[PDB]
Design a protein around this ligand. Structure first.
Ligand SMILES: Nc1ncnc2c1ncn2[C@@H]1O[C@H](COP(=O)(O)OP(=O)(O)OP(O)(O)=S)[C@@H](O)[C@H]1O
Ligand SMILES: Nc1ncnc2c1ncn2[C@@H]1O[C@H](COP(=O)(O)OP(=O)(O)OP(O)(O)=S)[C@@H](O)[C@H]1O
Lengths: 328, 109, 55, 109
DNA sequence: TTTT
DNA sequence: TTTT
DNA sequence: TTTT
DNA sequence: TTTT
């Protein structure tokens, strides 16, 4: 009876193990991780939105939004964190726009990085496939997916009707690469622009580019929107960035987060940590007068940020409790 | 119905993936032996565990090639030991001929 | 037997979003009449919103 | 005198000649004026008032997609010229809005 | 892609 | 893939 | 297998 | 034996 079924099941599993190896069955204790390994983005608001405190490993992630929304430099913070981990990462850009001086201002070591200038999209795909399987690379960044063009359209003249061609090939590409991506636990992000399609007055007028199966394969998708910018005195110095979670498999969606992005320096970490500390009750504020532990740290974001940057230990202690009380 | 092919299609990110998990949980309630294979290789065992399905009493699969997914599915169905068989993202399945081919080669149909 | 699944709407409690309304329409069957579409809510984490449909 | 003129009757020919010259790599600065004045040949073949909305954008996006790699290769200088069209329902934000699709500003450094 |  |  |  |  039941013993017969168990014996047959064991025989089948043994045959699978013989033909294929350990891949038949998960390890009953080793396959179970209490926490999913991930890579933090350098902004705890985004991490807590992710519900795992970092970008999941081995899973496709996509970002789309209006043009010139700082998504490009948003990727660089992830690059810097990967370099901090020592993880080998490479960057490929289809639009062929990159300012290594700009990225260096962001603190990312451009030297420990592999660049790519793929003239054709097919070569971008071939090199991405080759590197992912190398398993040596750990974070893989492709920018401006829409800028990618099939070679068939290149060989064609201007204005020829090659509609519905990039989608099939990109679908094939993800189909080929997702297994390897899982194998190496590598980090692959995608960048899309926004195209408002015909007859879209119902639902959301905005629509992503790059076919449709992308979002199906992507385990997590984030929307980025430019709402406002911070102006100090007369000149403008940074742009306020609003990112809203639009799809996830490990965390509840629609966990939108607010944060400021300052040019050159990058992420305005002090402001967000201050805001969440004061709103959660960790940091007391008598109305509009900022304070901490009954001490007049200062009034205004700049004074508190200066007070916090000189003492990284205090900031580290302050952020340590936040993730523990929120993420876990 | 038992012993009959059933198919589900719809727009991306429509919760079809987690829709299957309710069926998995009911099969586990029946005690029926079930296994899950995913061609897109996307699965959150924490997410499924939140759905109440016992992930432990389940056989996972991470088929690098579609042909291996098919061979393992055939082997298990004939084992007759498994009772519910789940394959996700059929479109994500790719013939090995296209894998051996370069990017953009015409392997239509 | 073939079933179509379509995302029509989602349920929002207060400000945050907590679940998605799922519309599934029968498109082919051999044992039952087709086009017997059904309405039901899907709540994240917990799963199927059984109480609502039974009510 | 030390300058090459062009009088492209159709926008497609303007694009083809621009692509040919950029790849020549001989030219060093490339100037195209009145991008909005560029018209797809499909609209030329069509009559007056026919609805060909959302056509120039796709082709110009394709054009930049093709040409940006060569532009990087030759370190050439490419400028674009746009007029201003105030779009519907723009009372919030900046009423002014550029022409020539949207991906232009994405590609423009 | 304004309009009085 | 917008457009005035 | 969409696309502006 | 379709495919976007
Ligand atoms: N070298 C730089 N010097 C000063 N500000 C910069 C520099 N590079 C980028 N920024 C600013 O950073 C913000 C976003 O720019 P980036 O992240 O570098 O590029 P990006 O706009 O994200 O890429 P896109 O949107 O796909 S064109 C904007 O506010 C820019 O003004
Ligand atoms: N771990 C999770 N935490 C919170 N919500 C989740 C989680 N996993 C899934 N969901 C939600 O469940 C709904 C459908 O997701 P899933 O069923 O898990 O995956 P799926 O979207 O069905 O698979 P696809 O559509 O082929 S990508 C969405 O509303 C998700 O936000």
């Amino acid at each position: 009876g039941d013993e017969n079924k168990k014996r047959a099941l064991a025989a089948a599993l043994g045959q699978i193990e013989r033909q294929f190896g350990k891949g038949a069955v998960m390890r009953m204790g080793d396959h179970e991780r209490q926490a999913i390994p991930a890579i933090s983005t350098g902004s705890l608001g985004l991490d807590i939105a992710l519900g795992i405190g970092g970008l999941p490993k081995g899973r496709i992630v996509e970002i789309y939004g209006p043009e010139s929304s700082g998504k490009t430099t948003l990727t660089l913070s992830v690059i810097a964190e990967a370099q901090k981990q020592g993880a080998t990462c490479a960057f490929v850009d289809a639009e062929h726009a990159l300012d290594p001086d700009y990225a260096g201002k962001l603190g990312v070591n451009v030297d420990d990085l592999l660049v790519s200038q793929p003239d054709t999209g097919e070569q971008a795909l071939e090199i991405t496939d080759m590197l992912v399987r190398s398993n040596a690379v750990d974070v893989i960044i492709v920018d401006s997916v829409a800028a990618l063009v099939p070679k068939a359209e290149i060989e064609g003249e201007m204005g020829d009707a090659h509609v519905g061609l990039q989608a099939r090939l990109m679908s094939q590409a993800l189909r080929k690469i997702t297994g390897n991506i899982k194998n190496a636990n590598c980090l692959v992000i995608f960048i899309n622009q926004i195209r408002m399609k015909i007859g879209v007055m119902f639902g959301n007028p905005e629509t992503t580019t790059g076919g449709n199966a992308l979002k199906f394969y992507a385990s997590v998708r984030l929307d980025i929107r430019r709402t406002g910018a911070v102006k100090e005195g007369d000149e403008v110095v940074g742009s306020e960035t609003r990112v809203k979670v639009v799809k996830n498999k490990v965390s509840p969606p629609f966990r939108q987060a607010e944060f400021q992005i300052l040019y050159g320096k990058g992420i305005y970490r002090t402001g967000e940590i201050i805001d969440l500390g004061v709103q959660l009750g960790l940091v007391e504020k008598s109305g509009a007068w900022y304070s901490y532990q009954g001490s007049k740290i200062g009034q205004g974001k700049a004074n508190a940020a200066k007070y916090l940057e000189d003492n990284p230990e205090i900031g580290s202690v302050l952020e340590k409790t936040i993730r523990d009380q929120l993420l876990a």
